[PDB]
Amino acid sequence: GKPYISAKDLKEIMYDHLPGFGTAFHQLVQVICKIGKDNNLLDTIHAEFQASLADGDSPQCALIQITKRVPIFQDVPPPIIHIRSRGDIPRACQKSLRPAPPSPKIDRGWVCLFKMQDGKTLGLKI
């Protein structure tokens, strides 16, 4: 197993065992890999991903566990993603949206915040 992994390669590993496309978990992989890359934590995240799968977790469960175990996901907010309309959010995410609370936390299931033109913001939530 690779002691040192790039953000591109980690994304690919995580995508390799997810069903579907444009799901809330695909978005979560992107969020985790960006935060991992920016904070030099990709190998910690990769280690936790592997350890969770070895415990018999689904890859989706493994991603949830990453958000709960790895401290950075308490340290950093869900990223704001600016979008032009509701239709820009992938169809597999459309039934995973809620109005954002004041202080949404990644470890509570808030993947990212889509900020739309009317000033309103829909959080993606698992």
Swiss-Prot record:
Protein name listed in UniProt: Polymerase cofactor VP35
Modified residues (Phosphoserine): S103
Stated family: Belongs to the filoviridae polymerase cofactor VP35 family.
Subcellular location: Virion; Host cytoplasm
Domain VP35 IID: 1-126
Cross-link Glycyl lysine isopeptide (Lys-Gly) (interchain with G-Cter in ubiquitin), where in sequence: K95
Quaternary structure note: Homodimer. Homooligomer; via the coiled coil domain. Interacts with nucleoprotein NP and polymerase L; VP35 bridges L and NP and allows the formation of the polymerase complex. Also interacts with VP30; this interaction is regulated by VP30 phosphorylation. Interacts with host IKBKE and TBK1; the interactions lead to inhibition of cellular antiviral response by blocking necessary interactions of IKBKE and TBK1 with their substrate IRF3.
Full protein: residues contained: 204 to 329 of 329
Function of the molecule: Plays an essential role in viral RNA synthesis and also a role in suppressing innate immune signaling. Acts as a polymerase cofactor in the RNA polymerase transcription and replication complexes. Serves as nucleoprotein/NP monomer chaperone prior to the formation of the large oligomeric RNA-bound complexes. Regulates RNA synthesis by modulating NP-RNA interactions and interacting with DYNLL1. VP35-NP interaction controls the switch between RNA-bound NP and free NP and thus the switch between genome replication and genome packaging into the nucleocapsid.
Gene: VP35
Superkingdom per UniProt: Viruses
Domain-level remarks: The interferon inhibitory domain (IID) binds dsRNA.
Reported modifications of this chain: Phosphorylated by host IKBKE. Phosphorylation contributes to efficient viral replication and transcription. Ubiquitinated by host TRIM6 to facilitate virus replication.
